[PDB]
Amino acid sequence: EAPDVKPWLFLIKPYEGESLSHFLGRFRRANHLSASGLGTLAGIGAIVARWERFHFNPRPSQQELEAIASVVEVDAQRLAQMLPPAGVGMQHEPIRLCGACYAESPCHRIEWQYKSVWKCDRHQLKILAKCPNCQAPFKMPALWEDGCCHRCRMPFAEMAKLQK
Amino acid sequence: SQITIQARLISFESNRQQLWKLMADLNTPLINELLCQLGQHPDFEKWQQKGKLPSTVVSQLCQPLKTDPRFAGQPSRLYMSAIHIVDYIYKSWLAIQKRLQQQLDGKTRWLEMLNSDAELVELSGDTLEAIRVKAAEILAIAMSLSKTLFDAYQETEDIKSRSAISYLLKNGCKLTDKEEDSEKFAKRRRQVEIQIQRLTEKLISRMPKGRDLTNAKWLETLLTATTTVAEDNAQAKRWQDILLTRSSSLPFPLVFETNEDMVWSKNQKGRLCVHFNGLSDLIFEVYCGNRQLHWFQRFLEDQQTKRKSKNQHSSGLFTLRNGHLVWLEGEGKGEPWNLHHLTLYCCVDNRLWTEEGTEIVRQEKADEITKFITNMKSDTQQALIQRKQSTLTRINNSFERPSQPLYQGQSHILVGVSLGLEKPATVAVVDAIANKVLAYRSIKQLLGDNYELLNRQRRQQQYLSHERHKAQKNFSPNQFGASELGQHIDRLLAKAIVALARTYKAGSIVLPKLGDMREVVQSEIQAIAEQKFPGYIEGQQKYAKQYRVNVHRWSYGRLIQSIQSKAAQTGIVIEEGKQPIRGSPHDKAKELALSAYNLRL
Amino acid sequence: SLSTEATAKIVSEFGRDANDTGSTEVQVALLTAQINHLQGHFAEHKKDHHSRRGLLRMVSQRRKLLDYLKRKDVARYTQLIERLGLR
RNA sequence: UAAUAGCGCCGCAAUUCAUGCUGCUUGCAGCCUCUGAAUUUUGUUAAAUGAGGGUUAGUUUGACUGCAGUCUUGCUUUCUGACCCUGGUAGCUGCUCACCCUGAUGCUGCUGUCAAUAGACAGGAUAGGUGCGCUCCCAGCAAUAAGGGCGCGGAUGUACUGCUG
Numbered sequence A: 001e002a003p004d005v006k007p008w009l010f011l012i013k014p015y016e017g018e019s020l021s022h023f024l025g026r027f028r029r030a031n032h033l034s035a036s037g038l039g040t041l042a043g044i045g046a047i048v049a050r051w052e053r054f055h056f057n058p059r060p061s062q063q064e065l066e067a068i069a070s071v072v073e074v075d076a077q078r079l080a081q082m083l084p085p086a087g088v089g090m091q092h093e094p095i096r097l098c099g100a101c102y103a104e105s106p107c108h109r110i111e112w113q114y115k116s117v118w119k120c121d122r123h124q125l126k127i128l129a130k131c132p133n134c135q136a137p138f139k140m141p142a143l144w145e146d147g148c149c150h151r152c153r154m155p156f157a158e159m160a161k162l163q164k
Numbered sequence B: 001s002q003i004t005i006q007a008r009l010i011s012f013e014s015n016r017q018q019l020w021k022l023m024a025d026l027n028t029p030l031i032n033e034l035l036c037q038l039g040q041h042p043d044f045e046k047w048q049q050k051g052k053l054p055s056t057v058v059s060q061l062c063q064p065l066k067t068d069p070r071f072a073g074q075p076s077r078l079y080m081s082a083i084h085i086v087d088y089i090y091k092s093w094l095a096i097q098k099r100l101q102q103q104l105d106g107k108t109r110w111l112e113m114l115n116s117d118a119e120l121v122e123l124s125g126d127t128l129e130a131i132r133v134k135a136a137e138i139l140a141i142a143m144s145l146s147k148t149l150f151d152a153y154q155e156t157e158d159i160k161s162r163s164a165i166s167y168l169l170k171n172g173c174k175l176t177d178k179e180e181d182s183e184k185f186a187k188r189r190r191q192v193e194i195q196i197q198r199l200t201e202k203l204i205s206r207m208p209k210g211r212d213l214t215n216a217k218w219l220e221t222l223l224t225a226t227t228t229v230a231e232d233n234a235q236a237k238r239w240q241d242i243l244l245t246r247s248s249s250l251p252f253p254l255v256f257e258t259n260e261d262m263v264w265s266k267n268q269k270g271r272l273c274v275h276f277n278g279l280s281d282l283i284f285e286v287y288c289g290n291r292q293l294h295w296f297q298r299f300l301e302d303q304q305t306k307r308k309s310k311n312q313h314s315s316g317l318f319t320l321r322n323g324h325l326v327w328l329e330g331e332g333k334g335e336p337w338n339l340h341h342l343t344l345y346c347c348v349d350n351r352l353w354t355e356e357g358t359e360i361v362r363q364e365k366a367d368e369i370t371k372f373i374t375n376m377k378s379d380t381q382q383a384l385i386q387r388k389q390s391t392l393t394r395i396n397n398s399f400e401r402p403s404q405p406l407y408q409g410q411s412h413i414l415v416g417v418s419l420g421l422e423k424p425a426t427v428a429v430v431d432a433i434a435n436k437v438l439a440y441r442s443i444k445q446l447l448g449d450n451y452e453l454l455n456r457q458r459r460q461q462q463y464l465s466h467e468r469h470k471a472q473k474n475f476s477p478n479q480f481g482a483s484e485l486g487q488h489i490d491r492l493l494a495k496a497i498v499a500l501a502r503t504y505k506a507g508s509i510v511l512p513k514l515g516d517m518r519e520v521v522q523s524e525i526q527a528i529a530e531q532k533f534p535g536y537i538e539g540q541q542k543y544a545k546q547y548r549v550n551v552h553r554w555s556y557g558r559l560i561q562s563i564q565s566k567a568a569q570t571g572i573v574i575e576e577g578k579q580p581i582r583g584s585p586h587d588k589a590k591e592l593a594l595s596a597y598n599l600r601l
Numbered sequence C: 001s002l003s004t005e006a007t008a009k010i011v012s013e014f015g016r017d018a019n020d021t022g023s024t025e026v027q028v029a030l031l032t033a034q035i036n037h038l039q040g041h042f043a044e045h046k047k048d049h050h051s052r053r054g055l056l057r058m059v060s061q062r063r064k065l066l067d068y069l070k071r072k073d074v075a076r077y078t079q080l081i082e083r084l085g086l087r
Numbered sequence D: 001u002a003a004u005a006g007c008g009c010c011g012c013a014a015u016u017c018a019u020g021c022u023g024c025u026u027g028c029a030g031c032c033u034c035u036g037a038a039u040u041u042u043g044u045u046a047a048a049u050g051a052g053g054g055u056u057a058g059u060u061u062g063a064c065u066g067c068a069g070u071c072u073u074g075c076u077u078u079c080u081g082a083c084c085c086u087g088g089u090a091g092c093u094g095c096u097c098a099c100c101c102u103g104a105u106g107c108u109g110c111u112g113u114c115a116a117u118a119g120a121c122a123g124g125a126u127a128g129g130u131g132c133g134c135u136c137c138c139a140g141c142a143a144u145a146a147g148g149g150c151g152c153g154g155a156u157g158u159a160c161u162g163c164u165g
Helices: A020-030 A035-042 A045-051 A062-073 A076-082 B014-036 B042-048 B059-069 B076-113 B118-122 B128-142 B147-156 B161-171 B184-200 B217-228 B232-243 B295-309 B354-376 B379-394 B453-473 B483-501 B517-532 B539-541 B545-552 B555-568 B585-598 C004-014 C024-042 C049-072 C074-083
Strands: B002-010 B255-256 B262-266 B272-274 B284-287 B320-328 B341-349 B410-415 B427-431 B437-442 B505-514 B575-577
Touching: A020 A035, A020 A045, A020 A062, A020 A076, A035 A045, A035 A062, A062 A076, B002 B076, B014 B059, B042 B076, B059 B076, B076 B147, B076 B161, B076 B184, B076 B255, B118 B128, B118 B161, B128 B147, B128 B161, B147 B161, B184 B517, B217 B232, B217 C024, B217 C049, B232 C049, B262 B295, B272 B295, B284 B341, B295 B341, B354 B379, B410 B483, B410 B585, B427 B483, B427 B585, B437 B483, B437 B585, B453 B483, B483 B505, B483 B555, B505 B555, B505 B585, B517 B539, B517 B545, B555 B575, B575 B585, C004 C024, C024 C049, C024 C074, C049 C074
Parallel strands: B410 B505, B505 B575
Antiparallel strands: B002 B284, B002 B341, B255 B320, B262 B272, B272 B284, B320 B341, B410 B427, B427 B437
């Protein structure tokens, strides 16, 4: 038996605006989990493999976000801030990137998927929807392990130089 | 007891074209009188609460449309045909909506009432035995039982001790010693939630649609969608849902609810003829096989017998009851009145064929008319009582008709019929005072020479379902199925079951209270599938497709009706009972008949 | 679908340059040409279900291209709507 | 060449009784010659089922009166037979494809002759695999389930069968 340890996981702190797909992706690298493994631990089954793709066709319910909150130690009201606000239409096909800000905070911000967003206001730069050199479309944000293009291996921080 | 017989009607073009023009023009006020209720009428939600349409409202919407410039060109009987159809549309749809509302409430009760054994202990603050003791007291008070216990939970909350009344109700109105598995209870409570959800969805229904022949909405939408730009995804899809819609090709049928509004005659050539009230210029010729001709001769003999007798006999006993005149769809090219085929469908009360059967209808109507007059007892209401009393007097004067002694069966001998997925029927004939089965039949006996047709039906359903899939992927128009073969097999079994009931002089045939098996299975398989594919909704739907599909293809209501019809034409009583959950198909049939006999008192 | 000569003719008139092989002007105009040839057949051949699938796709693409152009540049959008006779 | 397996049917063989067959005890004894239920077996010039697409106001299943005599209509469907075809040019129109990998409820599969090009000619419902069929299996193709890889041009503020025909 254990000598007086408290039950634990490699918890992670969320960044100031990352998407739920990106956060779950980091959580399941801090702990080595598969997408269906994290869904099974949370008790919500195969649901997590939709959310990592932004397949929010039926939206994340209060009861499902609370189930994830019991794993990841973030309350349901802070998990809701990683999803679009009520009636803010997102798009889940083109994954998009600022890249200039990815040097200030290495994350996929949820706001880059809003249908109303076309330029990052912190930097006044046009948002990217493909790698500026090889034209490859970005992987889903849960898979942003390297923080670079998967085809030509150019860092996302260097795509700051190639945009607008 | 009623049947429908049919004949094609033949005439020269001018007559088949003039009737089409009146039906293409009549088909339109059947649309406008729907809309005058579907959105125009303010009281509509009061009707949805009551479940019934007011008996005069459609006539009061139609009366001012009789002078409409679009609708004014039609006989007084074609407006009554419009009023009839639209009355029957709404009078059906409101009665569908009301039984759904009642089911949703009647299970919303039960989703509140259904609690685990641990929840009853918490809710009572007492032992599960104290609950068993109170459940035993409640059965002692009650001895309508299941309703009385439901009412005793709806009344009589009794310091939450209605917990024990729910304990009886979940145990099937009986005491139970066993304490239940929370996983089995979770599946059980989830089935009710699924039924509740499904009912709250089905509660909303598409407001009953008219058969538009004009294509005008479709043509306007086409030229809109191809020349303009939608402002929204909702508008772009609204045009798609219109452009995908297949438009009707046939007008609504004429309905003639008064038998005398068809007039029969014999042509010079010896053929029978017919004409309709308001269309008395357009003579039509009857064409039908000699297997059905005897009714069309009887129509003319009933009419001649009344006319030869100075109207002293009543059409209250005419063999014809009502006619529906319809254009059946033809094939290939030509004008609609040259391409389609006028067909007259006659409702006939089969027991009016014989004198011994006509006497049943004489007594049935004479009792109903007498009660009507005594319930009534104003100006036109007196004129209506003149119609009724001329009937109550005239109905005693007999038509000269064929004689055949009525069938009589033994009040103790019953035929039990057991229906299922693998065995569509199986039969046990029981002498209920001997408790002795006189005979059993399985399907291989019960349709004999035809037993190859069950194997044909299963081959044809499987073969044709795959061909329809292959055809849809190619947009081929070829789409076929085993529906007429299934209808024939259900009729072969219905004749054989009643021939067997006559053979053993049975007093009745017993049919199971199957109820809505399709919805029950759909909820059970869903509550289970949610435990095996959690979150993967596509996997939940794929769980037992062939079982759910075979239950949705299960023709039990059509076999039950086929047996009812043939039994009532023979004179054998129909009775009903609970079908056993366990036992062989024979044991099911045996216990079903004995249960229906026990229910006599 | 269009003849070879008809595509070359349309791309040379809506394209900003001969090498403008796929601007929104070109794509929307080409779709408009197809749709204008398909409504004349689909209004006559009312039983031709397989062609209603083709039309409903082809109209829905035109709308996406136009919505994209509207936000990208309203002047290009306004001129294109004029030159194609749309409302 | 291949198709071993799985699943659904069809009988064939038992084995166990009855809704059956002999008795009178009108409920028992007795067996499987029939007629039927249940399980298990089988693939034997056994037997039985056996979906390439089409064709007749076809015949029989009918009414009335004492099984004989009159009258008779051509409606809507399910089978069994039989016969025919395995298509022709004249427009309109949808989808699919730069090029690759995986290969789907994907397409294709008969006999004979000539070519051995991918196609003609003459036969034909025996028509890939088994007793008979499949979304299964074998062989060929696979752009027209889907996913992934990825070249040059157009666009590149999220649109892009949007190019390579």
